[PDB]
């Protein structure tokens, strides 16, 4: 931040950029190192009623694998063919 | 339901249909086909079928599993064939993954799949090193992870966590030496399993 | 036995050998093998040193965590000697020098210092005492070194009657001043391997019979000095007035004293280990 | 003649140590035989003696340049087996720090590649940027590297107040830093001489040899798991996948530089779309309760006690879960036997298959090119050896 | 969506061909690189003057361990062993018995700081804020043995650093 | 087309002719497989479907869209792969009955 | 402190020349900062 | 009792490979002693080879024998190509291990192990 | 093609276990008793 | 006499602690924090600790990461080839005593089983600043050496 | 409440001290035995008993969520105080 | 008390550049060669 105006011009010209607008050294734009206390929200299971665990028990909804064939018509692929990607409109060529 | 992972029945149905497809085409080798509740397809095969099944899945136009994601082994000592060989394949054409599993024991070799996937070269060296499964017709089978002269296969369930030997530098012989392992603090085994059943859906019959 | 010094384990690095040893002279040629062997089996080793801590670093990896303890000490300060041996069950004296210096003469290192160590060890209640003398110690030697070895050998026995005195021949090994001495440049020599001397010292600690005895540690074969020097130059593919006098003293034959065999150690032939020592510098007939 | 490469360069390097046994004829390399296992630490066996939570820090130490991305891969695998879902705010935080981690990895990959080729200066400029990103890690987790922040169920703690403003200030200037790096390298004829047409791999070979990530896209393959098999909230952000045309070291370098720019583009959307709410799944049988609840409610105390001693049980099953890690496809084949400790955890490191292809890629090149090819694969031996 | 990083046709008109010949013969793009390093020469360096200046840290920082007390001076630890159970490195060793006044307190509390991975799971697991990772990170030693902390060392760390530890916990406890 | 975009995959001058030959060879090879083998029934079905599209569509861009197998040179590569597989399937004969059943508890998880 | 300096150089300590009986004129180290100042010097807080 | 072979279909075929491997190890020992500058003699090295072979002399399963030869060849390749270092070769001799008691009385004095 | 092996299965020589921990160990095969506290 | 030996010790100690050329064994993640100590914020070069140093030109070895059994002989060899005076800094839990992998079959439980160690830097990883504190602590260890004082009194 | 044994070695708050013939005290020669001087058993005994009106009182160690889990203490017995099982504070019904 | 957690400012953050920016500088090929040749001619003269 404290470079002389001549030195600012020299390193701007040499680099070809406006370095002063995006200095890699941090000054006072950063957040204060002491912040006000948070007050964090609670999740959707924080209820006093209509909140029985057996209605929101993901672990107990898991099942053993479905057995399709055990050693005890149109052809198919494992999924539909992937759709061809589109060229970026933001910038197709670097 | 915010905390529960949502189902995807469309993919479950697609994978089931393709599972039957593979079983119908390779009945000589396929022993079981299952789709997990989170939509993953596993083809369980006889070990003789490794090359035919993998080749089919790589080259068939309705499969095209061109990429071998991972090849590994699992040790289950209670099984007559304690080693389960797991191939995780990926198809970029159909944006899908399949898993192929076979089995072997300590003395029965498995055909090397290097001819199907060049990726298999080192994966099979690692399985040989860590589990002691021999792969027939492997171009260059030898240890890859363990130290030279290391005895045993550390990923077997009956290999001790800290092994049998440990190294130190000895001034008298002016070299690093190997000696039987002694620990200043033994690893403390914990019994964590609750005596109460957790998941009724997986209860085995008495 | 105090409960803390009952042996436990399998004789390895993390084991407890029950030995609590203070090794004076541990930073030298013989001391590094003695400390290593003590640390191999999980002994507590106290290492009083005169040198800079930098010169003790090679001893650090020789024991498990906490098993090697370093202390400062002065040869002429008895309080520093007492602090080192106060808690030990054995004291090993390997102090010595092959030359004299301005501050320490042969009488200082081979008489006054060993006597002071032995006296403080007895006053401290130390049970065992190992003292290294020399096979050719004699009060009629042309060598001031060997004369002092004899006087000190007598004072140690008087002060610590239960001391185990060991009298090795010239010792050969990687860090010796014997084979290396010849590779850098009538009499009959019986050189003894460093590891044999070390094993014998370790066995004298564990052997209750060795108390009060004097041992002579010698190699298997006797070599005419000329044949020995020619052999060294062949294997190698190629000083002070006192040192020359010592080297030209014929190794005394003392059949009355017990040797390595009595301590369960098998003397290593020179020919087996000659290459090991002299490889970095790149068979003599014995006397039956 | 036979020759062995040194374990590592004579300047600080953090990729690990490699024993490369080579066969040469004149200047040309005829055979490359990497000898690894020098950083094999039996991670996969150690995990079997840990609860699912206890094993999470092991993933920080695999590809230890992409810590939180490795955490994400393991967390997703356990969440899948648990059949639970992390809350939306945690998913956005995971994507935000996943892309910050991608920046950390790509700086290390590009600048140490240049440093080993002799271009020392960019390493110093861009590692000041890495130092500032280490501060973001430290402010959310208390650790600069091995955060252990992303866990099954969400993240450990919410962002501290004021952190997102600082991430914005950093991101605002980063593209300029990339431009300075490109000024040094992109058009440099010496850099192009060291990278152009070096280590060419065909699209067909790259697939069969098990390659992933930039090692595929450099050869024109249009594949990125964030696009094709999206996880967390990657389907909700816009970005482009850079694709190469020559399949050589230079194109892969361009892909990594452009990916850094796309990571900034994603970070920008994450900073603006961050939702409110809780940051770990509101299921106390999986995620521990808040400390205030643990100290007041009987149920919360029990669940806290059990989650930190036994840990949660995972339903029996096996999953292969993969993500687009900065080095490529990073996956875990995780086997649960129904208990609170995993039965088997195989780790798929993208650098494992990439390094296995070093001999193929180095054919017909000179000794100095071997250094360039190792750099273009971006190999860290924590993930290779595990 | 994708983009090409290197799919461009150089123009073959004479003006463009001569631009590339000028770059080849006159080293223009090499001169440009010299401009960039010159500009850095005149930038203020990023170096700080350690140990007089220190790198910034946050209250959450995981540093040297300490055992804490209540305001009355009683130890917070009640030997529940949750920290010992969760520790991923098995770095913690605890023994306990009834204290002479009947209290539930430890007789051994060891942390092997060379096993520890400084992960902070112990302080997450602790139900009474007894074991914490403090802000200190400058405790390197000359011997291995000095890093095997016993209970007295950890209590001394708590008494040494409590002033900072308490303020840091005050700053972050609402995020926990 | 100047380039396929995939390194090592050359452009094909005559893709319609190349596919017609390859798909015809595949159908010829499948004739040596038993009529009841599922591989023959399925492979013939998809091969005939693609062969018809090649005959219906003389525009490569519009043919590529119909087939949905990437670039036309990717379709040709996949046809060469299928033909290679078909020849190998004749020696493996995977339509035969299961070579052997696994031990009773081989695929039981958890144990 | 000097808040015109960039973050990192904006706070510093000039160590005492003697601490706990040790001559620290030339030999200084980071462990000499007491905990109440440790927090401020490392920017864990804004208030000294 | 019908199994897939590794290499040899019976013990006679397996014993041919064992003898071929012994020949290769026997001829390698002099080179190993020179290359690694070992302090052991060639006779000591060849005696070590014999001892390692002898300890497996009781096997009667051709598959187990195949694996032993497979591993023995791997060990030889490590030695010939000098992938091993001096320490790895000398690990066959356990020079720093103190002899462990064999008879009942010696074991009884030193601990509880059988 | 398969071969015939009538030997009793034994892998002691190919597991890498030291002889001391094969021949002097006593394995106990049991179903653990219920923890009486629960 | 004693005055001249005392000052010569100060001069040689000053030269050696002011010109510490490190050989870094970048074994695992700890090496990353070592690179950050070389990076601009800390710039170890400004203390005289050069960036690039050959093993035969080195005065201090920094063991930055896990030491495996497979790697231990090679690390010892590099230490043995170091010209004296030579010092070893153990950085991080793995190097200090095995750390997270202490109970692994393939890991050396502390590099001090292979080489003598002068400074142990704790952490997993230690921060770049904690490593720099350790290097500064080694410098003060060298400052306390009395090599000529000991030699004079021999 | 530190006290030195007959050999001069301080006893810790856990009662540890090497006895007379224990070699292990050699580790402290030239160094020191780290002993914390603030014995918690003595410090908690200096706290006054708190006089309360109700039969049942609750303690959370003070500081709200920065204390210990909140427990409730019965004060019916008049022969002794109610002692908090976490922090050792004592209460008595008045 | 209202919920207070780290959130973006109302209206979001300002734009963040990410595309490559390597500005063009210097003369054309013709101009540079002319300058170089003119320098030689003056030197020769
Ligand atoms: C042989 C040649 C060397 C011997 C000749 C000595 C030349 C005079 C040097 C005096 C420098 C003193 C600067 C000063 O007052 O300190 C400010 C400083 C406090 O200032 P500050 O608050 O930090 O603010 C500084 C600026 O804001 C931030 O810094 P800044 O960069 O923005 O400005 C500082 C100033 C400093 O410039 C100078 O004074 C030196 C100019 C001569 C250059 C010699 C080459 O630079 C300028 O003003 C630019 C004009 C100077 C000409 C620049 C030409 C650059 C080359 C052109 C491009 C071509 C590239 C190829 O006080 C000090 O710390 C004093 C330290 C003394 C260091 C030693 C300097 C003497 C050099 C050794 C002498 C022989 C022994
Ligand atoms: C040939 C001539 C050699 C000239 C010797 C130059 C010594 C300069 C010097 O020691 O710096 C002062 C040094 C600097 O002190 P320092 O090196 O201990 O620490 C300086 C403060 N820090 C490190 C925080 C920046 O003073 C001394 O420490 C005394 C050593 C004197 C050595 C000279 C022996 C005569
Ligand atoms: C050196 C100090 C740094 C100068 C700043 C760099 C600079 O501005 O030069 C960039 C300029 C543009 O070149 P470039 O972007 O590569 O495009 C092709 C040519 N227009 O490129 C140039 O104009 C550089 C011209 C160099 C002239 C040749 C020098 C010969 C030296 C011997 C006389
Ligand atoms: N080597 C041989 O061939 C034989 C040796 N011996 C005896 O074995 C013992 C050791 O042999 P070796 O180890 O080869 O001798 P070294 O000279 O190799 O070691 C000598 C030891 O004595 C210490 N020492 C020497 N002078 C003093 C002193 N004035 N004050 C304090 N400590 C001192 C040295 O410490 P620092 O390192 O500080 O100098 C060193 O530790 C000696 O007693 C020697 O006489 C007996 C017969 C043969
Ligand atoms: S920080 Fe982690 S590794 Fe260290 S003691 Fe605590 S739980 Fe164990
Ligand atoms: S420190 Fe905390 S978690 Fe550990 S035993 Fe004590 S009270 Fe329990
Ligand atoms: S101590 Fe921690 S950071 Fe260092 S190598 Fe080991 S795991 Fe990685
Ligand atoms: Zn209380």
Specify the residue for token string 């693609």. Answer: F50
DSSP secondary structure letter of residue B204:
P
Three-class DSSP category at A18: coil
DSSP 8-state secondary structure symbol assigned to residue G30: G
**Apex CA B129: angle with CA B123 and CA B135, to 5°?**
60
The answer to whether residues E107 and E97 touch, using CB atoms and an 8 Å cutoff, is: yes
The token pair that represents H64 in the structure block: 């187990």
Per the annotation, where are the binding residues of J for [4Fe-4S] cluster?
29-30, 94, 124
Instruction: Determine the distance separating the centroid of ligand 2 and the alpha carbon of J59, expressed in angstroms.
Output: 19
Strands B30-35 and B41-45: antiparallel
Task: Choose among D124, D96, D84, D147: nearest CA to D313.
Answer: D84
What whole-number distance in Å separates Cα of residue B22 and Cα of residue C98? 86
Answer yes or no: is the C-beta of E79 below 6 A from any ligand 6 atom: yes
- Alpha-carbon gap, residue H8 to B128, rounded angstroms: 20
Q: What is the DSSP letter of E44?
A: P
The C-alpha atoms of residue D266 and residue D258 are separated, in whole angstroms, by 12
Picking from D321, D317, D313, D320, the residue whose alpha carbon sits closest to that of residue D336 is D317
Long-range contacts (CB closer than 8 Å, 24 or more residues apart) made by B170-175: B170/C36, B170/H96, B171/C32, B171/C33, B171/C36, B171/C58, B171/C61, B171/C62, B172/C33, B172/C36, B172/C37, B172/C195, B172/H96, B173/H90, B173/H95, B173/H96, B174/C174, B175/H86, B175/H87, B175/H90, B175/J73, B175/J76
Interface membership of A15 toward G (CB under 8 Å): no
Closest H-chain CA to J73: H87
Burial class of residue K31 in the structure, from the number of CB atoms within 10 Å of its CB (0-12 exposed, 13-18 middle, 19+ buried):
exposed
Distances (CA, A) of A17 to A13, A22, H104: 7, 10, 86
E65 in a known ligand binding site: no
Q: With an 8 Å Cβ cutoff, are E1 and A88 in contact?
A: yes
Q: CA C259 to CA C167: how far, in whole Å?
A: 9
Type and span of the H or E element at D96: helix D88-117
Name the residue with the closest Cα to ligand 3, atom 9: E32
Sheet holding B67-75, edge to edge: A66-70, B30-35, B41-45, B96-104, B83-91, B67-75
3-state secondary structure of D216: helix
Return all residues near G28 (Cβ < 8 A) that are at least 6 apart. Answer: E51, G15
Host domain of residue H23: 1-114
For L19, the 3-state DSSP assignment is coil
- What is chain J's alpha carbon radius of gyration, rounded to the nearest angstrom? 16
Sign of CA dihedral B44, B50, B56, B59: positive
Beta strands in chain E (DSSP E): 2-4, 65-67, 92-98, 104-112, 131-133, 148-149
- Residue B154 DSSP label: T
**Ligand minimally distant from the alpha carbon of residue D59:** 7
- C-alpha of residue A7 to centroid of ligand 3, in Å: 20
HSE, side-chain direction, 13 A CA sphere, residue J56: 0
CA distance C179 to C166: 21
Cα J28 to Cα A51: distance, rounded to the nearest angstrom: 48
Answer yes or no: are the C-beta atoms of C65 and C14 closer than 8 Å. Answer: no
Measured in angstroms, the CA of G5 and the nearest CA of chain J are apart by 14
Burial profile C243-263: b = 16 or more Cβ within 10 angstroms, e = fewer: eeebbebebbeeeebebbebb
* CA–CA gap between residue B27 and residue I34 (Å, rounded): 45
State the CB neighbour count (10 A cutoff) for residue E12.
7
CA of K63 to the centre of ligand 8 (A): 11
- DSSP collapsed to 3 states, E47-88: CCCCCCCCCCCCCCCCCCEEECECCCCCECCCCCCHHHHHCC
Find out whether E83 is annotated in a ligand binding site: yes
Stretch (H or E) spanning D122: helix D121-141
- Return the C-alpha torsion angle K26, K30, K34, K35, nearest 10: 80
CB nearest to F78's CB, from B28, B55, B64: B64
Distance CA D32, CA D362 (A): 7
Task: State whether residue B25 sits within 8 Å of chain F by CB.
Answer: yes
Cross-chain residue pair B182–C65, CB shorter than 8 Å: no
The 3-state DSSP class for residue E138 equals: coil
Is residue D249 part of an annotated ligand binding site? Answer: yes
CA distance K39 to K1: 6
The per-residue DSSP string of chain J comes to -HHHHHHHHHHHHHHHHHS--EEEEE-STHHHHHHHHHSTTT-GGGGT--SS--GGG-SEEEEES--BTTTHHHHHHHHHHSPSS-EEEEEHHHHHH-GGGTT-TTB-S-GGGTS--SEEE-SSSPPHHHHHHHHHHHHHHHHT--HHHHHHT-
Distance of CA H89 to the CA centre of its chain: 11
Residue B97 vs residues B42, B93, B94, D223, D320: alpha-carbon distances, Å: 9, 11, 9, 14, 9
CA distance J101 to J28: 12
Residue F80 tokens read as 């060469």
Q: Which two tokens stand for residue A67?
A: 């057995």
Answer for the pair E16, D262: CB distance below 8 angstroms, yes or no.
no
Separation CA E128–CA K65 (nearest Å): 9
Task: Report the domain count for chain H.
Answer: 1
**CA-to-CA distance for C180 and C185, rounded, in angstroms?**
9
Three-class DSSP category at B37:
coil
Report resolution in angstroms: 2.4
- Contact call for residues B40 and F111 (beta carbons, < 8 A): no
Q: Quickly list DSSP for chain H.
A: -EE--SS-SSHHHHHHHHHHHHHHHHHHHHHHHHHTT-SS-HHHHHHHHHHHHHHTTT---HHHHHHHHHHHHHHHHHHHTT-S-HHHHHTTT-TTSPPPP-SHHHHHHH-S--
Question: Is the C-beta atom of E94 inside 6 A of ligand 6?
Answer: yes
**Measured CA distances, F15 to D122, D202, D336, F12, F72 (Å):** 48, 21, 49, 6, 7
* DSSP conformation letters of chain C: --GGGS-BSSSSTTSB---EEEEETTTSHHHHHHHHHHHHTT-EEEEEESS-GGGGGGGGGGSSTTTEEEEE--TT-HHHHHHHHTT-SEEEE----SS--SS--HHIIIIIHHHHHHHHHHHTT--EEEEE--TT--TT-S-HHHHHHHHHHHHHHHH-TT-EEEEE--EESTT-SSHHHHHH---EE--EEHHHHHHHHHHHHH-GGGTT-EEEE--S--EEHHHHHHHHHHHTT---HHHHHHHTSPPPP-TTS--TGGGT-PPPPHHHHHHHHHGGG----B--
Sign of CA dihedral B123, B129, B133, B134: positive
Does residue E29 line the site of ligand 3, with CB under 6 A?
yes
Residues F76 and F16: beta-carbon distance below 8 Å: no
Which of E72, E102, E170 is nearest residue K43 as measured by Cβ atoms? E72
CB-nearest partner of A67 from B12, B32, B38: B32
Q: Report the sign of the C-alpha dihedral through residues C15, C20, C25, C27, in that order.
A: positive
Q: Which atom of ligand 2 is nearest to the CA of J140?
A: 18
Mutate to test the pocket of ligand 1, among A3, A6, A7, A20 (most ligand atoms within 8 A of CB): A7
Q: Are J107 and J72 in contact (CB under 8 A)?
A: no
CA distances from F102 to A72, B26, B107, F105 (A): 9, 16, 17, 8
Smallest CA–CA distance, residue D86 to chain B, in Å, is: 7
Phi and psi at F106, nearest 5°, equal: -65, -45
What are the C-alpha distances in Å from A14 to residues D178, D366, E43, F74, L17? 17, 36, 12, 49, 22
Work out the number of other CB atoms within 10 angstroms of the CB of residue C102.
8
Q: Is H114 an interface residue toward C (CB < 8 Å)?
A: no
Do you find a cis peptide bond into J125, omega within 30 degrees of 0?
A: yes
Compute the nearest-CA separation of B49 from chain D (Å).
20
Q: How many helices (H) and strands (E) does chain L have?
A: 1, 0
The pair of three-digit structure tokens given for residue D162, joined into one six-digit string: 């004021």
Cα distance between residue B9 and residue A58, in whole Å: 17
- The first and second tokens of residue D194, run together, are 């060291």
F9 → closest Cβ in D201, D203, D244: D203
G38 close to G30: Cβ distance less than 8 angstroms: no
In K1-94, where do the E strands start and end? 3-4, 10-11, 50-52, 56-59, 71-74, 82-83, 90-93
Residues of C in contact with K22 (CB under 8 A): 2, 4
- Sort A4 into a burial class: Cβ within 10 Å, 0-12 / 13-18 / 19+: exposed
Nearest alpha carbon to residue D385 among D5, D19, D9: D19
Q: What is the DSSP string of F27-40?
A: HHHHTTS-TT-HHH
Distance CA(F81)–CA(E84), nearest Å, equals 58
How far is F95 from C271, CA to CA, in rounded Å?
73
Which atom of ligand 7 is nearest the CA belonging to J100? 7
Q: Nearest-CA neighbor of D377 among D332, D328, D331?
A: D328
């Amino acid at each position: 931040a404290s470079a002389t105006r001549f030195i600012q011009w020299l390193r701007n010209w040499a680099s070809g950029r406006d370095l002063q607008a995006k200095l890699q050294l941090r000054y006072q734009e950063i957040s204060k190192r002491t912040q006000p206390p948070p007050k964090l929200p609670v999740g959707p299971s924080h209820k006093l009623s209509n909140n029985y665990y057996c209605t929101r028990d993901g672990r107990r909804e898991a099942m053993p694998p479905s057995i399709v064939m055990s050693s005890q018509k149109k052809a198919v692929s494992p999924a539909p063919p992937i759709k061809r990607w589109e060229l970026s409109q933001d910038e197709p060529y670097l | 339901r915010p905390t529960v992972r949502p189902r995807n029945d469309v993919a479950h149905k697609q994978l089931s249909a393709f599972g039957e497809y593979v079983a119908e085409i390779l009945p000589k080798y396929v022993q079981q086909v299952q789709v997990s509740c989170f939509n993953e397809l596993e083809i369980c095969i006889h070990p003789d079928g490794v090359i035919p099944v993998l080749t089919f899945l790589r080259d068939h136009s309705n499969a095209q599993f061109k990429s071998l994601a991972d090849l590994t082994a699992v040790d289950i000592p209670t099984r007559q064939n304690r080693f389960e060989i797991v191939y995780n394949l990926l198809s970029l054409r159909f944006n899908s993954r399949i898993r192929v599993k076979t089995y072997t024991d300590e003395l029965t070799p498995i055909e090397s799949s290097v001819p199907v996937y060049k990726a298999a070269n080192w994966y099979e060296r690692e399985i040989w090193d860590m589990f002691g499964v021999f792969f027939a017709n492997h171009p260059d089978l030898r240890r890859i992870l363990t130290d030279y002269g290391f005895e045993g296969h550390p990923f077997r369930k009956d290999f001790p966590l800290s092994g049998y030997v440990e190294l130190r530098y000895d001034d008298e012989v002016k070299r690093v030496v190997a000696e039987p392992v002694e620990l200043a603090q033994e690893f403390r085994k914990f019994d964590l399993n609750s005596p109460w059943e957790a998941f009724p859906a997986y209860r085995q019959p008495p | 036995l105090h409960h803390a010094v009952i042996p436990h384990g399998k004789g390895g690095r993390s084991s407890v050998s029950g030995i609590v040893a203070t090794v004076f002279g541990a930073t030298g040629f013989l001391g590094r093998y003695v400390v290593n062997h003590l640390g191999r089996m999980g002994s507590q080793v106290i290492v009083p040193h005169r040198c800079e801590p930098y010169d003790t670093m090679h001893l650090r990896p020789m024991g498990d965590l906490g098993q090697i303890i370093f202390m400062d000490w002065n040869g002429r300060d008895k309080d520093s000697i007492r602090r080192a041996v106060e808690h030990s069950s054995v004291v090993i004296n390997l102090v010595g020098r092959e030359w004299e210096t301005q501050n320490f003469d042969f009488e200082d290192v081979f008489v006054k210092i060993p006597q002071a160590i032995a006296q403080v060890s007895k006053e401290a209640g130390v049970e065992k005492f190992i003292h290294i003398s020399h096979l050719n110690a004699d009060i009629k030697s042309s060598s001031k070194y060997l004369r002092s070895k004899a006087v000190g050998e007598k004072e140690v026995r008087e002060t610590f009657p239960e001391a185990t005195i060991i009298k090795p021949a010239e010792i050969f090994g990687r860090e010796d001043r014997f084979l290396n001495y010849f590779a850098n440049i009538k009499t009959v020599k019986q050189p003894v391997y460093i590891v044999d001397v070390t094993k014998g010292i370790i066995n004298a600690i564990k052997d209750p019979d060795a108390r009060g005895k004097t041992f002579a540690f010698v190699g298997p074969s006797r070599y005419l000095l000329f044949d020995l020097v020619q052999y060294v130059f062949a294997v190698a593919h190629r000083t002070t007035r006192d040192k020359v006098e010592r080297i030209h003293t014929t190794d005394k034959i003392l059949p009355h004293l017990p040797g390595l065999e009595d301590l369960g150690v098998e003397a290593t032939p020179l020919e087996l280990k000659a290459i090991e020592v002299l490889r970095r510098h790149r068979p003599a007939k014995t006397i039956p | 003649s036979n020759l062995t490469l040194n374990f590592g360069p004579q300047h600080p390097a953090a990729h690990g140590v490699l024993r490369l046994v080579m066969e040469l004829s004149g200047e040309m390399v005829r055979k490359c035989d990497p000898h690894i296992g020098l950083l094999h630490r039996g991670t996969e066996k150690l995990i079997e003696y840990k609860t699912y939570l206890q094993a999470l820090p092991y993933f920080d130490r695999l590809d230890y340049v992409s810590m939180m991305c490795n955490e994400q891969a393991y967390s997703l695998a356990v969440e899948k087996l648990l059949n639970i879902r992390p809350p939306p705010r945690a998913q956005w935080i995971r994507v935000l720090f996943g892309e910050i981690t991608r920046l950390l990895n790509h700086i290390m990959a590009v600048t140490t590649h240049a440093l080993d080729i002799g271009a020392m200066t960019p390493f110093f400029w861009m590692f000041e940027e890495r130092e500032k990103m280490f501060e973001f890690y430290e402010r959310v987790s208390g650790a600069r590297m091995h955060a252990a922040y992303v866990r099954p169920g969400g993240v450990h703690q919410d962002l501290p107040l004021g952190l997102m403003d600082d991430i914005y200030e950093f991101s605002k200037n980063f593209s300029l830093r990339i431009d300075e790096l490109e000024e040094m390298l992109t058009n440099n004829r010496i850099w192009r001489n060291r990278t152009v047409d070096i280590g060419i791999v065909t699209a067909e070979d790259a697939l069969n040899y098990g390659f992933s990530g930039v090692m595929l896209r450099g050869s024109g393959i249009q594949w990125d798991l964030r696009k094709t098999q999206p996880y967390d909230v990657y389907d909700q952000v816009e970005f482009d996948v850079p694709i190469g045309s020559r399949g050589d070291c230079y194109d892969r370098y361009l892909c990594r530089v452009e990916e850094m720019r796309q990571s900034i583009r994603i970070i920008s959307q994450c900073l603006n779309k961050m939702p409110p709410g809780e940051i770990k799944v509101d299921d106390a049988k999986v995620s521990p309760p808040k400390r205030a609840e643990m100290k007041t409610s009987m149920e919360s105390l029990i669940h806290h006690f059990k989650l930190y001693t036994e840990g949660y049980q995972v339903p029996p099953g096996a999953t292969y879960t993969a993500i687009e890690a900065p080095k490529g496809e990073f996956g875990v084949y995780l086997v649960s036997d129904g208990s609170s400790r995993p039965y088997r955890c195989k780790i798929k490191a993208p650098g494992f298959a990439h390094l296995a292809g070093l001999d193929k890629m180095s054919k017909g090149h000179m000794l100095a090119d071997v250094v360039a090819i190792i750099g273009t694969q971006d190999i860290v031996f924590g993930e290779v050896d595990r | 969506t994708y983009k090409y990083v290197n799919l461009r046709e150089p123009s073959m008109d004479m003006k463009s061909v001569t631009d590339r010949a000028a770059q080849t013969l006159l080293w223009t793009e090499l001169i440009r690189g010299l401009g960039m390093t010159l500009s850095y020469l005149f930038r203020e360096p990023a170096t700080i003057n350690y140990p007089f200046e220190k790198g910034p840290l946050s209250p959450r920082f995981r540093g040297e361990h300490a055992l804490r007390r209540y305001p009355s001076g009683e130890e917070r630890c009640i030997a529940c062993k949750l920290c010992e159970a969760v520790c991923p490195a098995q770095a913690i060793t605890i023994e306990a018995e009834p204290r002479a006044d009947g209290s539930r307190r430890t007789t051994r509390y060891d942390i092997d700081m060379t096993k520890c991975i400084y992960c902070g799971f112990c302080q997450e697991a602790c139900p009474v804020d007894a074991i914490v990772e403090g802000p200190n990170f400058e405790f390197s030693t000359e011997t291995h043995e000095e890093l095997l902390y016993n209970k007295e060392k950890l209590l001394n760390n708590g008494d040494k650093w409590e002033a900072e530890i308490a303020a840091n916990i005050q700053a972050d406890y609402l995020y926990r | 087309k100047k380039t396929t975009g995939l390194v090592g995959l050359a452009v094909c001058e005559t893709p319609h002719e190349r596919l017609k030959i390859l798909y015809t060879k595949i159908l010829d090879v499948l004739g040596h497989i038993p009529k009841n083998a599922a591989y023959r029934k399925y492979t013939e079905q998809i091969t005939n479907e693609k062969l018809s599209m090649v005959k219906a569509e003389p525009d490569v861009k519009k043919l590529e869209e119909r087939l949905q197998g990437g670039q036309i040179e990717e379709v040709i590569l996949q046809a060469e792969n299928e033909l290679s597989l078909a020849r190998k399937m004749i020696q493996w004969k995977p339509w035969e009955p299961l070579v052997e059943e696994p031990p009773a508890s081989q695929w039981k998880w958890p144990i | 402190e000097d808040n015109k300096q960039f973050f990192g150089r904006h706070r510093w300590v000039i160590y005492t020349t003697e601490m706990n009986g040790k001559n620290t004129f030339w030999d200084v180290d980071g462990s000499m900062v007491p905990p109440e100042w440790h927090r401020w010097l490392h920017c864990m807080t804004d208030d000294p | 009792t019908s199994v897939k072979p590794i290499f040899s279909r019976d013990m006679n075929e397996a014993k041919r490979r064992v003898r071929e491997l012994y020949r290769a190890w026997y001829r390698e020992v002099p080179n190993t002693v020179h290359l690694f500058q070992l302090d052991i003699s060639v006779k000591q090295g060849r005696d070590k080879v014999r001892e390692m072979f002898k300890k497996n002399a009781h096997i009667t399963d051709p598959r187990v024998v195949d694996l032993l030869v497979i591993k023995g060849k791997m060990e030889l390749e490590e030695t010939i190509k000098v992938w091993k270092q001096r320490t790895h070769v000398m690990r066959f001799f356990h020079e720093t291990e103190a002899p462990r008691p064999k008879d009942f009385l010696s074991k009884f004095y030193v601990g509880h192990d059988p | 093609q398969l071969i015939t092996v009538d030997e009793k299965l034994d892998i002691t020589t190919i597991t890498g276990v030291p002889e001391e921990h094969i021949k002097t160990r006593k394995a106990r095969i049991f179903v653990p008793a219920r923890n009486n506290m629960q | 006499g004693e005055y001249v030996v005392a000052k010569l010790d100060d001069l040689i100690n000053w030269a050696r602690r002011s010109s510490l050329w490190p050989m870094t064994f970048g074994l695992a993640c700890c090496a990353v924090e070592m690179m950050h100590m070389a990076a601009p914020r800390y710039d170890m070069d400004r203390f005289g600790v050069v960036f690039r140093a050959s093993p035969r030109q080195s005065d201090v070895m920094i063991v930055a990461g896990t030491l495996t059994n497979k790697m231990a002989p090679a690390l010892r060899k590099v230490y043995d080839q170091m010209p004296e005076p030579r010092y070893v800094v153990s950085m991080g839990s793995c190097a200090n005593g095995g750390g997270y992998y202490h109970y692994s079959y393939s890991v050396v439980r502390g590099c001090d089983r292979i080489v003598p160690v002068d400074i142990y830097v704790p952490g997993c990883p230690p921060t770049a600043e904690a490593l720099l504190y350790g290097i500064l602590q080694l410098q003060k260890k060298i400052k306390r050496e009395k090599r000529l004082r000991i030699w004079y009194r021999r | 409440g530190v006290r030195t044994s007959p050999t001069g070695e301080k006893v810790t708050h856990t009662g540890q001290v090497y006895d007379d013939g224990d070699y292990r005290k050699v580790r402290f020669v030239g160094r020191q035995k780290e002993v914390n001087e603030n014995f918690a058993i003595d410090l908690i005994a200096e706290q006054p008993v708190s006089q309360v009106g109700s039969r049942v009182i609750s303690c959370d160690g003070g500081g709200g969520a920065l204390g210990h889990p909140r427990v409730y203490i019965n004060l019916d017995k008049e022969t002794k105080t109610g002692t908090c099982g976490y922090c050792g504070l004592q209460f008595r019904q008045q | 008390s209202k919920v207070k957690q780290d959130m973006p400012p109302v209206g979001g953050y300002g734009p963040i550049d990410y595309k490559r920016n390597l500005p063009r500088r210097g003369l054309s090929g013709y101009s540079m060669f002319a300058v170089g040749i003119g320098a030689l001619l003056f030197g020769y003269w």
